[PDB]
Every structure is written in structure tokens, then in C-alpha cells.
Scaffold this active site. Sequence first.
Site, mmCIF file in Angstrom:
data_model
loop_
_atom_site.group_PDB
_atom_site.id
_atom_site.type_symbol
_atom_site.label_atom_id
_atom_site.label_comp_id
_atom_site.label_asym_id
_atom_site.label_seq_id
_atom_site.Cartn_x
_atom_site.Cartn_y
_atom_site.Cartn_z
ATOM 1 N N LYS A 186 -24.173 23.115 31.621
ATOM 2 C CA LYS A 186 -24.567 22.800 32.976
ATOM 3 C C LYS A 186 -26.019 22.653 33.044
ATOM 4 C CE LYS A 186 -20.492 25.027 34.793
ATOM 5 N NZ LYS A 186 -19.859 23.410 35.146
ATOM 6 N N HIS A 204 -27.530 23.025 17.118
ATOM 7 C CA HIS A 204 -26.267 22.580 16.329
ATOM 8 C C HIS A 204 -26.389 21.214 15.778
ATOM 9 C CE1 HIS A 204 -24.498 26.434 17.123
ATOM 10 N NE2 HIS A 204 -24.052 26.055 18.314
ATOM 11 N N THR A 238 -36.425 24.407 1.439
ATOM 12 C CA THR A 238 -37.736 24.462 1.552
ATOM 13 C C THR A 238 -38.296 25.826 1.941
ATOM 14 O OG1 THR A 238 -39.927 23.805 2.438
ATOM 15 C CG2 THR A 238 -38.019 23.733 3.873
ATOM 16 N N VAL A 286 -40.719 26.711 6.132
ATOM 17 C CA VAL A 286 -40.063 27.195 7.233
ATOM 18 C C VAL A 286 -38.936 28.232 6.794
ATOM 19 C CG1 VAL A 286 -38.581 26.619 9.248
ATOM 20 C CG2 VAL A 286 -40.016 24.717 8.228
ATOM 21 N N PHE A 339 -30.084 35.738 14.604
ATOM 22 C CA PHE A 339 -29.002 36.846 14.970
ATOM 23 C C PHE A 339 -28.075 36.218 15.385
ATOM 24 C CE2 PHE A 339 -32.261 39.826 13.844
ATOM 25 C CZ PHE A 339 -33.584 39.232 13.997
ATOM 26 N N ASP A 369 -26.932 32.887 26.133
ATOM 27 C CA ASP A 369 -25.559 33.351 25.764
ATOM 28 C C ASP A 369 -25.024 34.658 25.173
ATOM 29 O OD1 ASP A 369 -26.316 32.092 23.205
ATOM 30 O OD2 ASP A 369 -24.876 30.466 23.548
HETATM 31 N N1 LIG Z 1 -18.712 22.569 20.850
HETATM 32 C C1 LIG Z 1 -17.890 23.527 20.637
HETATM 33 C C2 LIG Z 1 -17.189 24.929 20.529
HETATM 34 C C3 LIG Z 1 -15.945 24.787 19.980
HETATM 35 C C4 LIG Z 1 -15.371 26.003 19.752
HETATM 36 C C5 LIG Z 1 -15.635 27.055 20.143
HETATM 37 N N2 LIG Z 1 -17.162 27.085 20.671
HETATM 38 C C6 LIG Z 1 -17.714 26.222 20.961
HETATM 39 N N3 LIG Z 1 -19.221 26.278 21.394
HETATM 40 C C7 LIG Z 1 -19.525 27.577 22.346
HETATM 41 C C8 LIG Z 1 -20.678 27.092 22.990
HETATM 42 N N4 LIG Z 1 -21.764 26.809 22.161
HETATM 43 C C9 LIG Z 1 -23.028 27.111 22.197
HETATM 44 O O1 LIG Z 1 -23.260 28.121 23.282
HETATM 45 C C10 LIG Z 1 -24.068 26.532 21.523
HETATM 46 C C11 LIG Z 1 -24.402 25.149 22.107
HETATM 47 C C12 LIG Z 1 -25.971 25.114 22.147
HETATM 48 C C13 LIG Z 1 -26.689 24.384 23.410
HETATM 49 C C14 LIG Z 1 -28.139 24.768 23.845
HETATM 50 C C15 LIG Z 1 -28.724 23.984 24.795
HETATM 51 C C16 LIG Z 1 -28.239 22.807 25.038
HETATM 52 C C17 LIG Z 1 -26.805 22.504 24.515
HETATM 53 C C18 LIG Z 1 -26.196 23.272 23.605
HETATM 54 C C19 LIG Z 1 -26.433 26.814 22.185
HETATM 55 N N5 LIG Z 1 -25.389 27.319 21.457
HETATM 56 C C20 LIG Z 1 -21.505 25.569 21.577
HETATM 57 C C21 LIG Z 1 -20.259 25.653 20.531
HETATM 58 CA CA LIG Z 2 -28.647 32.864 16.630
HETATM 59 NA NA NA Z 3 -35.916 27.845 4.672
HETATM 60 ZN ZN LIG Z 4 -24.906 29.560 21.667
#
Ligand SMILES: N#Cc1cccnc1N1CCN(C(=O)[C@H]2C[C@@H](c3ccccc3)CN2)CC1
Ligand SMILES: [Ca+2]
Ligand code: NA
Ligand SMILES: [Zn+2]
EC number: 3.5.1.98
Length: 366
Positions: A23, A133, A182, A185, A190, A256
Site C-alpha cells: 500500500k 528483491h 565483488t 560492496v 538480518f 515488516d
Molecule cells: N511476492 C511475494 C510473496 C510470495 C509468497 C510469500 N511472500 C511474498 N512476499 C511477502 C512480502 N514481501 C516483502 O515484504 C518484500 C517486498 C519488499 C518491498 C519494499 C518496498 C516496496 C515494495 C516491496 C520488502 N520485502 C514480498 C514477498
Molecule cells: Ca533483511
Molecule cells: Na559483495
Molecule cells: Zn519484506
Amino acid sequence: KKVCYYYDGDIGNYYYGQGHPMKPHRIRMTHNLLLNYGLYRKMEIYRPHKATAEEMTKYHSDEYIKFLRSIRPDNMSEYSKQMQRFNVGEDCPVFDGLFEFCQLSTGGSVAGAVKLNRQQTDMAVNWAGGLHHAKKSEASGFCYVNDIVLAILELLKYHQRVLYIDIDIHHGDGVEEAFYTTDRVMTVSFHKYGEYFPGTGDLRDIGAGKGKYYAVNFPMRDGIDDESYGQIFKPIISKVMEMYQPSAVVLQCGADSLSGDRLGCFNLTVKGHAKCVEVVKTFNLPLLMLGGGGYTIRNVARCWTYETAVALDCEIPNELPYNDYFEYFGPDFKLHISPSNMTNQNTPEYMEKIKQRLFENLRMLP
Ligand SMILES: N#Cc1cccnc1N1CCN(C(=O)[C@H]2C[C@@H](c3ccccc3)CN2)CC1
Ligand SMILES: [Ca+2]
Ligand code: NA
Ligand SMILES: [Zn+2]
């Protein structure tokens, strides 16, 4: 210490679709809350530019970026094979303004990195970033363009060694992958591990080639609390700083990992999460702070508001100021959150054994 902060007033208007847990409105709620705390009086606020295809293709493939620039709800039927190839259309949906969303998200992060490189600020903040990701040629995990990788590439123009730290509950796989071979970086994540998205981030994943020992993964179980997290974060980052001696830091502050998150299963408070920001600040290195996940959106607004205050070395009251989303913060209308009674599956011995293995790997540096 100067703070510059990036926000575009349209960011909260991009919509992933009915039922989708991501969201962007949570960024607008964050902005509104910190405006009502008065924190705008203490930092420079900028609208991000719309990152160009030229900027995005510094990492991403040309064909993938051209596709993102092309795909719309109205033409999905014509693009179904490209949608499959680039992994767009399900968990990474097609929505109106998708490309503009990517442009503003990425623009904040790259703009922040340029400001740090120019020594025009000490800290830059982009809560719309942190899309860890996204891969070179495919979307993943709600992420289309890897703003973090692009920002780090910008820092690497001026900085020999850049440290990436990721406190999102998910492994920052796209960032780790980009820099896995590399030593310029070091990536430190965690994250929850054990048949959990994205499936990567084993503590045996330490990098490859010149990058061997420059990827660091701390896999955790459900229910980690502030005390447990704090007792491994400060020693591991202290050792990373001592052994790696980076000249710039990028911190992904995904929310999260907080208690009560709709998708995550950790038990951190906003204070426990923000302690990570405080720790990284003590090293006095140019610092880019980015957003990330977070699905209980009242707690996301609280977390990033408080972390902005931490960046500004400003305490702010627990009593929330009136704001345009005030009803979202019931029943207590406080900034800080309490942990739940969920069991912490991370035993003291587990935490210390993993830390000891990571210390042994860090001692392998030159
Ligand atoms: N597709 C999927 C999925 C499938 C199964 C189980 N879980 C799934 N999700 C769980 C929730 N996820 C996250 O929280 C990632 C997204 C990331 C982000 C940050 C800022 C903006 C937009 C994305 C932060 N970490 C992605 C994967
Ligand atoms: Ca992390
Ligand atoms: Na590295
Ligand atoms: Zn996440």
C-alpha cells in the site's frame, strides 16, 4: 549532521490493486505524521526526479526496462509472453502508473546517493525506496526496479567500499545478488529464514570469487524481540565496520520486521527497530536510509516517523499530534508500540552460535 529527505506527493496514489498487501499510501501517512510533528523545520525536503530509463539501465537490462515502460492494464493481452518472462502480472501486478511509480521510487534513492557523494548532506532519506528483491531482468516480491542497487552503483563512483545493511524481515536477495562477486560492496541482511520468501540468505551464503566473505546473512526464526535483536545487531555491525572500513552506508529499514505486522512474524518495537539506525549513525559515515516492507500501515508510519527523528537527533513525544490519518492510530494514539506475547523461537544459544560463525567469517577479511 544534515538530513535531506525525498517525497513526491503522488507516491501514495499508486495502487497495486484490490487485495494486494503493498500500500504506497503508507508513505503518505508517514509524511503527514512527521509534518505534524514539525520535523520539516529541521531537514531539507526534496521532490525526487523521475529516474530515466538511462539511469535504470545502469543495472537493469534494456529489454526489461523497455517492457516496464510499455506495459499497461489496457494492453496486457498483447504482452502476455513478456509478462511471463519478466515475472509481471501476479505478485508483481500491472497497475496504472507502474513505470512512474518505479521512476519516483528510484529517483529518491539515486538523488540521495548523489547528494551524499557531493558532500551536500550527511544523511539522505527515501522511504519510497528499499525495493530489494528486483532482479537485473525480472520483477520479484512486489519489486520492479532495484533502487538500492542503482543507489549503491552511484556511491561506488566515489567510494571504494560501500556497506549495505538490510533489516527488512525478508532477505535482500536482489542486492546481495548484484554484488555477490565483488568486495566493493559488503551486504549484511538480518531476516527470517526457513521456507520463507525469498528462500535465500542461508548463513553459508558468504559470496563468491573476489566477493567471498563480503556477503553476510543472519538467519532468524519467528518472534525475535528487541533485546535479542539488539544483542546481535550492534556487535555484528561493529565488527563489520572494524574489518570492512566502508566509507558509505546504505540502510534498508523495512518495517515488516515489527511486532504486529500483517505478513511478518517478528516481535520488534519501533524503538528496537530504530536502535539499528542509532547504531549505524555512531560510525559517522555518509548514510542513505531507505524504506522497505511493512503491511500494518499505522506501524509503518510510526516506525519511519521515529527513524526520521533519530536521523535528526530529535526526540519526539509519544503522544501523537493530530494528523490527516489520526483515526488509523487508535486505540492508543501513541507513537510507540508494545511487543506481543508471541514466543521467541531464537534461543540465546542459537543467536550466539550464529554470531560466532559470522565473526569467524569476518575475521577472514584481509
Ligand atoms: N511476492 C511475494 C510473496 C510470495 C509468497 C510469500 N511472500 C511474498 N512476499 C511477502 C512480502 N514481501 C516483502 O515484504 C518484500 C517486498 C519488499 C518491498 C519494499 C518496498 C516496496 C515494495 C516491496 C520488502 N520485502 C514480498 C514477498
Ligand atoms: Ca533483511
Ligand atoms: Na559483495
Ligand atoms: Zn519484506
